[PDB]
Design a protein around this ligand. Structure first.
Ligand SMILES: CC(C)CCC[C@@H](C)[C@H]1CC[C@H]2[C@@H]3CC=C4C[C@@H](O)CC[C@]4(C)[C@H]3CC[C@]12C
Ligand SMILES: CC(C)CCC[C@@H](C)[C@H]1CC[C@H]2[C@@H]3CC=C4C[C@@H](O)CC[C@]4(C)[C@H]3CC[C@]12C
Lengths: 398, 398
């Protein structure tokens, strides 16, 4: 009768249920495919393209001669870029290595190209341009996940850069942390909080934006408060609002005068417009079909539209061609699950094939390089994507 | 430009991360395979066979003429049956529908047969017999999972029945709830708590066993306290101990006299033997290779041993023949993952094949019927398994 096992056990070190959930919920490679019922029919690259919904704020900024007024607009845009998150608790599809997404919005005067440049760590790079060459807006996002209590925090790591070309100025910042409450059981809902600093690298103007956490009682749900100061640290403007609604500007004096007087969703009031304030930005109302369509904005509903004409110009990596997202969008959930499993296995096989073949992954449209304004490691658009002439691109779809 | 999606979203109702985890951690069918690194190399059927480790308590009970002394032994056995759980935080493999497991321990004087009789809900039935026909011990277990805070509770649902055949008496009870703390992140550890009532259906004797929860401070970790009373509700014996260590008996008077005077594991003291107590049961010390071998008992190390002679008698459904458990036991984790995925897909295909074919699943060795002593719905051993002569058994392994 045996008195022992023929081999000792394997030491799993720190690996936990959280480890599995982290890879699954986040954008890391995961051996377990996230079930399609938790998805929304967008790639993560398309989800990030929603940064561009209020690009009119950038065109407005470019048209103004006063740098402090420009900073108001850039602060408005920074807040507007993250504003569409409320109730977007569907997970966008984990992009495949080498997946790309492009968007041309003639009516909004920009185009954008994005690529999934890595899974170690998962980084999504993007590069947007004003069609009349008034701006460049780029960055890259690695969503770093932590688990607290009943919640997951996604920290969007990477530098955000806005170049107003007519003024020879760049602005940089980082985005606030995004919080997903009730991640295991209960009603999913979303918070954003954190301290954002926008730096004008030509003038030394700085904008401080505090995305307030809830606070006990929840009085501060979604609140944004901050100010613009000049190179001398003199406060020039007070900015206040809610990232889910609006951003306003007011004289710092006037603001301080007025200022003296299962986790559930707290009741948040649309805050009062301090008299004399200037309106900088208000969110677009969500359309009437939004609640039946993953709580998408009207802007987000356009992201994955494809037509035959589009199919003749976009590269084979564009996620409009990703068949599992297409099937989910059309109401074919079992087809979506089926294709998703296929796509993820094909990508695992190709990675193993690259390992045994000794060859390295080549990102097609971005390269690593220092951010020219703050020195940070960055992913920089390499050019040429919009020339078309696509030669020997990754084969990632079925 | 499209203003809507071509199909409305799908309503997922109450489905959550917990829903996925419940199926995965528990014994339900799950589309997501639990990763082998969370397993221990045993089937759930083998894990339950550890109920039998201290069968000598049943032989002792059978040999005694006083029914109250018999009840002490049966209470000892009931506690002993669940005693091997401490630090067994590896998940036993989810049995396949129609999977079976047998154990003959000549040195311990019993044999046991078990079958996975259903996944809706997941029920594991078992039937053990004294080799000299002094007892029958049977039951069935559906592990019902709930998620509280940082913990999962597995409630082992089903009636437990012990028939002492020489005395024409049966005993029934239910097992305590098993708690897995730090289920998402941190160090996994195990508690059992709940109120167990053992009923002698010939005499009306009743044994009350309280498995105490922790309690704030954790003074009560693993403590068992209870008593035996007769049909007249007169208290006859006090029983006390820890399910991780021992069970003792003492005069109820003497006991009450003495009685006046990330979640971490609390410090628990081996409780003091009240003088005059009688020793009923003590746990076997875990062997020196235990901590390198999934914290198995010596008893558990025998469960999955197979030899060529065994392979000529056991049916093709015996989980000694299950290749993924075999591969994990041998240190072949990637082979184990590979075979596990295969086995689970083969079982999903066969279920779909049974659906389109209109035909129903037939359990081979148990049938449904009322428990003869309490009326509850039960799974009853049908006989004939030990005749061998296996004809047209399920084909469930690769
Ligand atoms: C599986 C289910 C339960 C979890 C769903 C998690 C979703 C809601 C999480 C996972 C990744 C998260 C994103 C990570 C990065 C960013 C960029 C940031 O600037 C805005 C928020 C945004 C876009 C997050 C929104 C919420 C997000 C999409
Ligand atoms: C995936 C990891 C993190 C979770 C591991 C869960 C394990 C430890 C759980 C899942 C099912 C549980 C079992 C369910 C039923 C019983 C019968 C009961 O009378 C004794 C405890 C016992 C045997 C439980 C022990 C712990 C158990 C095996």
């Amino acid at each position: 009768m045996r008195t022992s096992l023929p081999s000792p056990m394997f030491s799993r070190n720190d690996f936990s249920i959280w480890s599995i959930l982290r890879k699954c919920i986040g954008m890391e490679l995961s051996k377990i495919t996230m079930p399609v019922i938790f998805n929304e029919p967008l790639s993560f690259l398309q989800r990030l393209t929603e940064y561009m919904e209020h690009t009119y704020l950038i065109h407005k900024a470019s048209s103004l001669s006063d740098p402090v007024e420009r900073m108001q607009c850039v602060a408005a845009f920074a807040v507007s870029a993250v504003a569409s998150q409320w109730e977007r608790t569907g997970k966008p599809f984990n992009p495949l290595l080498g997946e790309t997404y492009e968007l041309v919005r003639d009516d909004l005067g920009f185009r954008l190209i994005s690529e999934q440049v890595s899974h170690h760590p998962p980084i999504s790079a993007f590069h947007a341009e004003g069609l009349n060459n008034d701006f460049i807006f780029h960055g890259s996002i690695y969503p770093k996940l932590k688990f607290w209590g009943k919640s997951v925090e996604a920290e969007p790591k990477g530098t955000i850069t806005l170049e107003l070309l007519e003024h020879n100025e760049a602005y940089t910042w980082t985005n606030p942390t995004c919080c997903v409450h009730n991640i295991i059981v209960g009603k999913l809902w979303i918070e954003q909080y954190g301290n954002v600093e926008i730096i004008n690298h030509k003038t030394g103007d700085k904008c401080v934006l505090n995305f307030k956490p809830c606070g006990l009682f929840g009085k501060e749900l979604h609140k944004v408060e901050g100010y613009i100061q000049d190179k001398s640290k003199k406060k020039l403007c007070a900015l206040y609002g809610k990232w889910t609604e609006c951003l306003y500007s007011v004289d710092p004096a006037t603001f301080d005068a007025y200022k003296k007087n299962e986790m559930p969703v707290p009741d948040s009031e649309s805050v009062f417009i301090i008299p004399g304030s200037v309106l900088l930005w208000r969110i677009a109302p969500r359309p009437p079909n939004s609640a039946q369509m993953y709580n998408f904005t009207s802007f987000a509903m356009v992201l994955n539209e494809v037509d035959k004409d589009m199919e003749s110009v976009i590269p084979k990596t564009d996620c409009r061609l990703r068949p599992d997202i297409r099937a989910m969008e059309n109401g074919e959930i079992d087809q979506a699950s089926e294709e998703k499993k296929r796509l993820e296995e094909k990508q695992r096989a190709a990675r193993k094939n690259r390992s045994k073949s000794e060859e390295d992954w080549k990102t097609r449209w971005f390269h690593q390089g220092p951010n020219p304004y703050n020195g940070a490691q960055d992913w920089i658009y390499s050019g040429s994507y919009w020339d078309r002439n696509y030669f020997n691109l990754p084969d990632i779809y079925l």
